[PDB]
Amino acid sequence: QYQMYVGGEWIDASNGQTEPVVSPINEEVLAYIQDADASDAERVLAVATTAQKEWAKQPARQRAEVLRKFAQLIRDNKQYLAELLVKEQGKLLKVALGEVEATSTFIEYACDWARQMDGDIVKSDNANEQIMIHKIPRGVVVAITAWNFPLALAGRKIGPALVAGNSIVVKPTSETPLATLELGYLAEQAGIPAGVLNIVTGGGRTLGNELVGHRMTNMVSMTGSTPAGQSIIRASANNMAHVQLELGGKAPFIVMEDADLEQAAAAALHSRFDNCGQVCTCNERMYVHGAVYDEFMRIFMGKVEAIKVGDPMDPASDMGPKVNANELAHMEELVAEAVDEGATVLFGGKKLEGPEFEKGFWFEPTVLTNVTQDMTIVHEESFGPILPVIKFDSFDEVIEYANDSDYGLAAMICTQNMHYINRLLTELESGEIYVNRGHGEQHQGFHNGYKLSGTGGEDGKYGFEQYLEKKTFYINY
Amino acid sequence: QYQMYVGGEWIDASNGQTEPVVSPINEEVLAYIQDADASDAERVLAVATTAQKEWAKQPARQRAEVLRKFAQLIRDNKQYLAELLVKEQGKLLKVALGEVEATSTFIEYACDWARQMDGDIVKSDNANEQIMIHKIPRGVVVAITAWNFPLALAGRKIGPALVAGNSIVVKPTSETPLATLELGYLAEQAGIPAGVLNIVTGGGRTLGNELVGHRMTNMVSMTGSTPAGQSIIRASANNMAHVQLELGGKAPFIVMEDADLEQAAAAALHSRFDNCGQVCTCNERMYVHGAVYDEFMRIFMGKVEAIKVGDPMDPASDMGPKVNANELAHMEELVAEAVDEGATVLFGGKKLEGPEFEKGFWFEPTVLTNVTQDMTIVHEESFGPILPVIKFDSFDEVIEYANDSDYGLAAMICTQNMHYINRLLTELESGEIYVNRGHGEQHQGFHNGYKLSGTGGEDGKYGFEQYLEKKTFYINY
């Protein structure tokens, strides 16, 4: 029976409600969590506010010292945390180990920024006057994390928020919170002061909505769905919290006529099927040039046929289960909707059958061909192992397709043509573009989406900057 | 009878409506303007969208050449435009000459930035890979300007927006929009391509709301009331536009025991009474140390008593009229409520009576004493010539008073104690701090408020930054 980590203590939701956490592998109950509502918001935000006053006054060098310790403790417990992620969320073991490591590196990359939170000395138009733009903490950050990579998403936000001198309240999704809650203990083993790092669980429209719109909240950093994000933006009207969101995506993977086909098929394969399609940057729609279609597809389909779906703890598995039943059902709906709209199911399209799959949420890798740009599958985010393939004949045409979307997070292209690549800068409306390579970003880049994929951007110089506020001084002598 | 500047043309509102623009000086009707509703928002945003694709193709150095021409054209017509601002808005002529000048220098400061729009080349963790973060235009910026400085605020937004490669749609407040509309003709003379700069007038709840919420809007930059800003934030849930708002303010003016009293009283004088109190950074509440109280107030009240209210075209005037009858009524409400709460009107508190003040909206310079920190006048923005004074005995006491606010933009303090001044960095919850001087920001600073004073921040390096999107590349070789 997990509790919440608040102000250095472990406590119950005051509404006394609990909830099981269920494994997508076999539907067993792994544990129970609190299911708090809006009555617990004021209390946790209040301890965060109070702990932040003293935490902010520490030299940044000392805050980074504490968090580097925190980061290493996570790595110490890598094997435990990774298997816990595999069970509660259903990613492959090797992928979970990658996520725990990324949780540590996210905090470590932010710790590099400690003595580089430079403010500006600006030249005044008046003699004997200084202008000073300082960088300071905002105050209290609320972090909302998703079930695709719950633990790494916590690291991605805890790191920057804390190094910058804020305190944080993390609300991991109730679908996959356990590994995240386990950080609570690691925080105390690291000596993060009581109240500076808080972890709570509850209802999205109750506890969540109360947190993000609250007057004690200065910033909301969140990953999830576009509608959930729009709700947070409305909520932020109440407090004028800075809002940083990573939301929906419908990334095009584009194979140009002069691409290295073997490289492109490999990059496209994993960009769609990594984490069972549950990545914000996934190849969600593939465009293949008609001069290379047949050859590209013998290669690509050769790789798809070899994807072994199975138990994520089993090293032989190339793909695990979908996260829950609603998301499984959604696979079936989209595939049925596509066939009905005239699509060809080239491979897959079914729940796995077999007595090994009587329990759990399992879907075949799926390739949909003879697809046209106006079909729903080319527009709606599947977030699962469903990939539609569209032919095109020229660069201008595929750029049109690519920008035909309410999303603009990631995109991938394969080509040898400098000029195509150069034109992407002004012509392709996606914020994170991969060339001759599949997805997967780095702590030091900028994870930024256009249109309805989010606000603010995450990671790197510009990401970290958002956890800071500015204070400007005009001083006259 | 003014029209709307859209797509290089002058057009009527589609709803056929018009309204008068009325002078606060003598209630004269100066001209008529279009009073468009929501049906004109899409058309405007769509021509601005179309015009920006072509504007972004003009290299930055060339866009800045165009806009420096525009800004000079503005200075050529300085006298015409200033005099028009005195009539429609009611500020003193010298202040209007100042405002026209600032409209230019805002645009010229933006132009300084034309070739300093650098992107970042980031080191990869991968052997043969380039990570590139480019800076590109957002697209279409909606600018909403307030009736305190309608022309300067347009320059404040037009410059950054257009230099960075955006197109803009300016909606000046219907109270004072004439001088802003006159930019339409100067834009054509300057060679600003049709559609890159559009000026429309209409209703807040209809035209204004439709613009800020629209899918074609990428950024909203607005000055005005806190509620009007919250409304903009809510609407941006629909489009996820970046939102840059300057809103309410309740700036404290703190006189310490060791302040230069004659310096402080003068700083405090113009910081409250500039522009008839109608400044976002105004001295809205004065805290005076008990030890210097009697001497400071004798000095300060000598300056208040010498303020001459009258015709803003007359060089002899020190203060002009309030913007309109509602705002005038509000001053009466605020002073009446202060008396009801136990306060003392030490000077002023009445409308001007005289043959010169029959027509027009005139309130005396007003100073309230015997006020306590809980009185309404200490917490609600007056935005007019009303100043409460509170005694305090220590630095810790007045910091609490200062931070007891829902606003956090400006703040002024007078002291010789550099230790007090340093403590403000961590202890004063205001974004713009003036030491031993009065308010008045510069284009290279960062005009940035906490709490309910707004979001994003304006001016300078970080203000210019917001008119830009990033686009990340991961290129593999």
**Are the C-beta atoms of B437 and B267 separated by less than 8 Å?**
yes
User: Are the C-beta atoms of A221 and A161 separated by less than 8 Å?
Assistant: yes
What CA–CA distance (Å, rounded) separates B170 from B331?
A: 30
Residues from chain A contacting residue B242 (CB–CB below 8 Å): 455
Q: How far apart are CA B209 and CA B39, in angstroms?
A: 11
Could you say which DSSP state residue A376 is in?
Answer: G
What residue type is B377 in one-letter code? I
B452 touches chain A (CB under 8 A): yes
Identify which of A445, A319, A448, A339 has the alpha carbon closest to the alpha carbon of residue A384: A319
Q: Rounded to whole angstroms, how far apart are CA atoms A290 and A390?
A: 9
Distances (CA, A) of A118 to A50, A108, A242, A322, A470: 25, 19, 20, 44, 11
* Cα–Cα distance for residue pair B199/B143, rounded to 1 Å: 9
Give residue A309's identity as a one-letter amino acid code: V
**Among A231, A240, A448, whose Cβ lies nearest the Cβ of B472?**
A448
Rounded alpha-carbon distances, angstroms, from residue B19 to A377, B28, B178? 50, 13, 12
Helices A226-235/B226-235 angle, 10° precision: 180
Indicate the pairing of strand B129-137 with strand B468-476: antiparallel
Backbone angles phi, psi at A363, to 5 degrees: -135, 140
Do A432 and B125 lie within an 8 Å CB cutoff?
no
Whole-angstrom distance, CA of residue B68 vs CA of residue B407: 36
Token pair 């990631």 is at which residue? A410
Do B56 and A441 count as a contact with CB atoms less than 8 A apart?
no
- The residue behind tokens 């050769």 is A302
Inspect the interface and report whether the beta carbons of A436 and B237 lie closer than 8 Å: no
Buried b (16+ CB within 10 A) or exposed e, A232-257: bbbbbbbbbbbbbbbbbbbbbbbbbb
Report the C-alpha gap between B151 and B98 in whole angstroms.
11
One DSSP character per residue, B132-153 reads EEEEEE--EEEEEE-SSSHHHH
Listed by number, the residues of chain B in 110-149 with a beta carbon closer than 8 Å to a beta carbon of chain A are 120, 122-125, 129, 131, 133-134, 136
Active site residues of A: 246, 280
Partnered with residue B21 across adjacent β-strands are: B31
- Cα A41 from Cα B359, distance rounded (Å): 54
Q: Which two tokens stand for residue A385?
A: 């192992």
Place of tokens 């703890």: A313
- Side-chain half-sphere CA neighbours of A149 within 13 A: 27
Tokens of B85: 């601002």
Chain B interface, best mutation among A474, A475, A476, by max B CB count within 10 A: A474
Residues B369 and B322 in one domain: yes
Count each helix (H run) and each strand (E run) in chain A, helices first.
15, 21
The answer to whether residues A167 and A22 belong to one domain is yes
Is A14 in the B-facing interface, judged by CB distances under 8 Å? no
Residue B180's alpha-carbon distances to A124, B74, B154, B172, B277, in angstroms, are 28, 11, 7, 7, 22
Three-state SS at A366: strand
| Nearest partner of A390 among A258, A249, A254, judged by Cα | A254
Residue numbers in B near A238 (CB within 8 A) = 230
- Name, in order, each residue with C-beta under 8 angstroms of A48's C-beta and a sequence gap of 6 or more: A140, A167, A168, A169, A195, A196, A198, A216
Determine the Cα angle at A330 with ends A327 and A336, to 5°.
155
Say if residue A265 is in the same domain as residue A283.
yes
Angle at the Cα of A455 (from B426 to B239), degrees rounded to 5?
A: 130
Cα–Cα distances in Å, from B419 out to B261, B265, B291?
19, 22, 19
Q: Residues B169, B139: contact at Cβ < 8 Å?
A: no
Which residues of chain B are within 8 Å of residue A476 when distances are taken between CB atoms? 434-437
**Partner-chain contact A474 B238, CB within 8 Å:** no
Cβ of residue B466 closer than 8 Å to a chain A Cβ? no
For residue A332, the SS3 value is helix
Q: Categorise residue B457: left if φ over 0, alpha if ψ from -120 to 50, beta otherwise.
A: left
Q: Give how far Cα A376 sits from Cα of A227, A247, A453, Å.
A: 18, 19, 18
Taking the C-alpha atoms of residue B329 and residue B217, their distance in angstroms, rounded to an integer, is 36
Shortest distance between the Cα of A14 and any Cα of chain B, in A, equals 29
Helix (H) / strand (E) containing A285: strand A283-289
Amino acid, res. A216:
M
Q: What sections of A191-260 are H helices per DSSP?
A: 209-212, 226-235
Q: Which of A123, A435, A472 sits opposite B433 (nearest CB)?
A: A472
Helix (H) or strand (E) holding A468: strand A468-476
CA distance A396 to B174: 44
- Total domains in the fold of chain B: 2
Cβ atoms of A158 and A198 closer than 8 Å: no
B184 plus B287 within the same structural domain: no
Mutate to test the interface with B, among A271, A406, A442 (most CBs of B within 10 A): A442
Resolution (A): 2.7
Distance between CA A130 and CA A119 in Å, rounded?
13
Q: How far apart are CA A203 and CA B403, in angstroms?
A: 33
What token pair was written down for A455?
């606000």
- Tell me the C-alpha distance between B55 and B373, whole Å: 52
Burial per residue of B140-159, b for 16 or more beta-carbon CB atoms within 10 angstroms, e otherwise:
bbbbbbbbbbbbbbbbbbbb
Which residues sit opposite A20 in a β-bridge?
A32
Please choose, from the candidates B188, B193, B249, the residue with its C-alpha nearest in 3D space to the C-alpha of residue B408.
B249
Does the distance separating the beta carbons of A421 and B129 come in below 8 Å? Answer: no
Catalytic positions of B:
246, 280
How much is the CA Rg of chain B, to the nearest whole Å?
23
Contact indicator for B458, B473 with CB cutoff of 8 Å: no
How far are the Cα atoms of B34, B37, B39, B46 from residue B12, in angstroms, in the given order? 7, 11, 12, 17
Contact A133 B445 (CB under 8 A): yes
- Comparing alpha-carbon positions, the chain A residue that sits nearest to B234 is A234
User: Does one domain contain both B120 and B177?
Assistant: yes
Q: In what order do the strands lie in the sheet containing B219-223?
A: B9-11, B4-6, B197-199, B167-172, B140-145, B219-223, B242-246, B454-455
Q: Cβ–Cβ of A474/B432 closer than 8 Å?
A: yes
CB contact at 8 A, A380 and A279: no
Contacts of B29 (CB under 8 A, 6+ apart): B20, B21, B22, B23
Contacts of B237 in chain A (CB under 8 A): 230-231, 233-234
- Based on the fold, state whether residues A345 and A268 are members of the same structural domain: yes
Cα torsion angle, A429, A430, A433, A436, sign: negative
Are residue A356 and residue A464 in the same domain, yes or no?
no
Q: What is the DSSP string of B30-66?
A: EEEEE-B-GGGHHHHHHHHHHHHHHHTTS-HHHHHHH
Nearest alpha-carbon partner for A38 in A172, A205, A168: A205
In the beta sheet, which residues pair with residue A19? Answer: A33
A449 in reach of chain B (CB within 8 A): no
Contact A272, A285 (CB under 8 A): no
Residue whose pair of structure tokens reads 């492109």 in the numeric block: A264
Smallest Cβ–Cβ distance between B472 and the set A57, A233, A446 belongs to A446
CA distance linking residue B353 with residue B130, whole number of Å = 72
Q: What is the CA radius of gyration of chain A?
A: 23
Rounded Cα–Cα distance for residues A205 and A203 (Å): 6
Among B residues 230-289, those touching chain A with beta carbons less than 8 Å apart: 230-231, 233-234, 236-240, 242, 245
Q: How far is A432 from chain B (nearest CA, A)?
A: 5
- Non-local CB neighbours of A174 within 8 Å, separated by 6+ positions: A19, A21, A33, A35, A201, A202, A203
Instruction: Mark yes or no for CB contact A471/B425 under 8 Å.
Output: yes
d(CA A397, CA A466): 37
Looking at the structure, tell me whether residues B320 and B187 fall in a common domain. no
Residue B107 tokens read as 């645009």
Evaluate the CA torsion angle B241, A235, A225, B463 in order and state its sign.
Answer: positive
Q: What is the dihedral angle through the alpha carbons of A460, B113, B249, B144, rounded to the nearest 10 degrees? A: -100
Experimentally, the structure was elucidated by X-ray
Gapped junctions in chain A, after residues (C–N > 2.5 Å): none
Q: What's the CATH code of the domain at A16?
A: 3.40.605.10
Q: Quote the domain boundaries for residue A428.
A: 249-442
* A358 CB-near residues (< 8 Å, 6+ apart): none
B196 and B120, same structural domain? Answer: yes
Burial class (CB in 10 A: 0-12, 13-18, 19+), B8: middle
| Helix (H) or strand (E) run with residue A422 in it | helix A418-427
Instruction: Tell me how far apart the alpha carbons of residues A272 and A265 are, in angstroms, rounded to a whole number.
Output: 11
Give chain B positions within 8 Å (CB) of A461. 120
Spatial distance between the Cα atoms of A370 and A341, rounded to a whole number of angstroms:
11
Separation of CA A343 from chain center: 30
Is A437 an interface residue toward B (CB < 8 Å)? yes
CATH code of the domain in which B367 resides: 3.40.309.10
- Whether residue B54 lies within 8 A of chain A, CB to CB, comes out as no
Q: Does residue A175 share a domain with residue A221?
A: yes
Q: What is the DSSP string of B237-280?
A: TTT--EEEEE----EEEEE-TTS-HHHHHHHHHHHHHGGGG--T
**B226 and B238 part of one domain:** yes
Structure tokens at A337: 């909707």
Residues A292 and A422 in one domain: yes
